[PDB]
Design an enzyme around this catalytic site. Structure first.
Site, PDB file in Angstrom:
ATOM      1  CG  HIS A   1     -74.575  72.186  42.388  1.00  0.00           C
ATOM      2  ND1 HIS A   1     -73.303  72.687  41.968  1.00  0.00           N
ATOM      3  CD2 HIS A   1     -74.808  70.956  42.117  1.00  0.00           C
ATOM      4  CE1 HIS A   1     -72.642  71.339  41.642  1.00  0.00           C
ATOM      5  NE2 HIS A   1     -73.708  70.622  41.477  1.00  0.00           N
TER       6      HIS A   1
ATOM      7  N   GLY B   1     -72.550  75.457  45.330  1.00  0.00           N
ATOM      8  CA  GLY B   1     -72.859  76.812  45.495  1.00  0.00           C
ATOM      9  C   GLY B   1     -74.360  77.096  45.313  1.00  0.00           C
ATOM     10  NE  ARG B   2     -76.913  83.060  45.954  1.00  0.00           N
ATOM     11  CZ  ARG B   2     -77.961  83.432  46.698  1.00  0.00           C
ATOM     12  NH1 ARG B   2     -79.156  83.569  46.306  1.00  0.00           N
ATOM     13  NH2 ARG B   2     -77.521  83.937  47.704  1.00  0.00           N
TER      14      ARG B   2
ATOM     15  NE  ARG C   1     -72.116  74.245  30.952  1.00  0.00           N
ATOM     16  CZ  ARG C   1     -73.131  74.270  32.185  1.00  0.00           C
ATOM     17  NH1 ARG C   1     -72.731  73.452  33.129  1.00  0.00           N
ATOM     18  NH2 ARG C   1     -74.025  75.332  32.216  1.00  0.00           N
ATOM     19  CG  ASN C   2     -67.609  77.922  29.580  1.00  0.00           C
ATOM     20  OD1 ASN C   2     -66.992  77.477  28.337  1.00  0.00           O
ATOM     21  ND2 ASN C   2     -68.959  77.757  29.698  1.00  0.00           N
TER      22      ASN C   2
END
Lengths: 396, 396
Positions: free
Chosen positions: A298, A295-296, A201-202
């Site tokens: 999530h 990823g980590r 979202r960024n």
């Protein structure tokens, strides 16, 4: 193309035929109507856009209980979270078989969908608690997804829907909002056979850019779909035009030709960690992706989930062969001084800690706000410039 | 990328910043307002979408007169047709500097744009007649463009606009409507350096398919943008989603990977023949096309224009240097049995009608109605199948 989940073709709920659309829109202005929650509205947009194919609308309580506890509907179809339309009361539509669902997130509450109501049910405290604990993995009212779910009322209305628009997600983001139907068409024509999907979202700095490239090389992908979560701007988020310019500039200057699709979708975050990761995989398969990066932590919040639970849920809990999409299991990255590039630390076991340089997304954002470009190991100059120009423009 | 006309970057009038968009939408509800003509609404959509870049809004009379007679604004910028917002009177907005423009084509007449009114002018009979004869090449009231132009009243309001949405064009056609901005971004994503644009409203059979391939081969194009005019349906029309499915099937099976973009735009046709061809070239340059196909009687109606006047206008009326986009000069095409390929007529003046395989529009639609495919020299079997499936599907 990878098959849609549970059918050979997508079955979106949007009224694509313009004549039928006009007739339904006209009809809806005289129907009994209810303003739904933002959660139900997002569910309707995802159904309209083919992301939740092949489902036809909102679930009754038996299907919701089955989805929450076992990731299946009562008839055995795979679907990982309940899709409910909960209301404080069904009094305004008492005895109606056909109703208009009105959008809570557009001024004046225009009609979003028409629904044929096949059941109206009260949900008990015990049923709510069961669904809450199963979907969110906790009963803690501090969990924002728990709080939203339990803040909608206890009357569930169920039945198939016909979707008339995609709410503010299309109106506010006309160049980026895409249906699963259109993403599948575009993958098809661009000729891509293996496709990685990445959610953000960024703006994407070098770490996220390189993570997409690592995933693409690992699975021999032809392209990546950057699938942006569209929604109302959250404190400290980059406004959409600036975010879009940064992502598009990265794509144009640092990826090869015909390797990136920049797109977006609209759906309220559940903050449900491993359970939400399964939902993410489901709709990404529907849009045509063959691989999905997880990823980590999530889709996580607070301390409720283990760092790799959203990866391992696919090993045991998700029924065998319901999904064809594969997970690319990501982890923390750093710039390797020895290799001269960004790597996943776990995949460079020959390195000591001193062989890495690390700079967090937080530190990058701080630097940009101070008008200092981060080192080129962590940010591309043209992306940095777009963000620095934005921060400098603010009256603050 | 080919440069936009009259600026280095597109200058669309859509409010891309969501927070500003929300502020303006809320402001607009409290402004004096007027319902504009369908022509003016179309003009605003094109301005919002970047197709009419670098213009800021509606023209004052001096600019409209200069555009009509010489295809330039009074300051010297190239623009080939007047962009007017004509009203029966300014009564609804008397004295106001800032007003809302409401959409005549959406139920409820929602706000389409906010406008700063910098002039209000009465158009004389002489001024109206001069603009009419110059733009349309005739003053005959039987020309449908002439009639539309002269049925809007005589009060011109002018000034910059800010566009809030794309009217029913995006709502009704969410997977195909595209802005000039997005088309230019996608051309970049795909890595194309030379791009042909082709307009149609109908399914593409073998003759149009091969027309596009001829154009691409002649100019060494990397891709073609099929740029469909979206609009209101008429009795008997093939629904838009069936038309799109037919064009996408052709694109997927009969063109190489990464060579076709299927898109649409919203505007009311002028039926202005050669003058409208110059406008098409203008906005296709803005969307990023390097070449544009113009065949026989392009944008024509009645017997007002010569069959290739829409090509020759670029030779003797359009100043050199104003457009960078090049015209591919086409003609009607048909499959020649003598040659075994689709040819433009002008490369076949020696042929008699019996040397071609030709079917009338009624013949094709009626045989598809009976589950019969045209011959493979006329239609691809998979495209015919899309159409046959529609005609044999349960009505409603």
């Amino acid at each position: 193309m990878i098959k849609p989940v549970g059918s050979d073709e997508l079955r979106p709920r949007f009224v694509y035929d313009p004549e039928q659309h006009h007739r339904l829109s006209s009809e809806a202005e005289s129907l009994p109507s209810v303003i739904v929650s933002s959660q139900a509205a997002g569910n309707a947009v995802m159904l309209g856009a083919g992301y939740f194919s092949p489902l036809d609308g909102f679930m009754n309580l038996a299907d919701a209980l089955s989805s929450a506890q076992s990731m299946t509907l009562t008839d055995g179809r795979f679907f990982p979270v309940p899709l409910l339309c909960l209301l404080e009361s069904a009094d305004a539509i008492a005895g109606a078989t056909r109703i208009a669902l009105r959008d809570p997130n557009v001024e004046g509450n225009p009609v979003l969908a028409v629904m044929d109501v096949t059941a109206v049910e009260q949900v008990s405290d015990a049923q709510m608690a069961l669904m809450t604990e199963q979907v969110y993995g906790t009963s803690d009212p501090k969990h924002p997804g728990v709080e939203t779910f339990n803040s909608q009322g206890r009357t569930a209305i169920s039945g198939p829907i016909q979707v008339l628009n995609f709410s503010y997600f299309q109106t506010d983001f006309p160049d980026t909002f895409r249906t699963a139907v259109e993403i599948r068409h575009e993958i098809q024509e661009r000729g891509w056979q293996k496709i990685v999907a990445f959610q953000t979202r960024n703006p994407m700095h070098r770490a996220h850019e390189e993570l997409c490239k690592m995933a693409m090389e690992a699975v021999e992908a032809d392209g990546v779909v950057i699938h942006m979560l569209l929604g109302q701007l959250k404190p400290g988020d980059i406004p959409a035009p600036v975010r879009d310019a940064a992502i598009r500039t990265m794509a144009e200057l640092y990826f090869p030709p015909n390797t990136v699709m920049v797109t977006g979708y609209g759906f309220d975050m559940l903050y449900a960690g491993p359970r939400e990761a399964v939902l993410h995989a489901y709709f990404r398969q529907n849009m045509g992706a063959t691989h999905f990066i997880i990823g980590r932590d999530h889709a996580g919040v607070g301390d409720y989930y283990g760092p790799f639970d959203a990866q391992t849920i696919f090993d045991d809990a998700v029924p065998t062969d319901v999904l064809a999409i594969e997970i690319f299991r990501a982890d923390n990255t750093a710039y390797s001084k020895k290799l001269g590039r960004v790597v996943m630390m776990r995949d460079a076991p020959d390195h000591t800690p001193d062989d890495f340089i690390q700079l967090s997304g937080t530190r990058v954002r701080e630097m940009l706000g101070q008008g200092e470009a981060p080192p080129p190991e962590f940010s591309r100059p043209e992306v940095a410039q777009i963000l620095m120009d934005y921060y400098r423009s603010l009256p603050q």
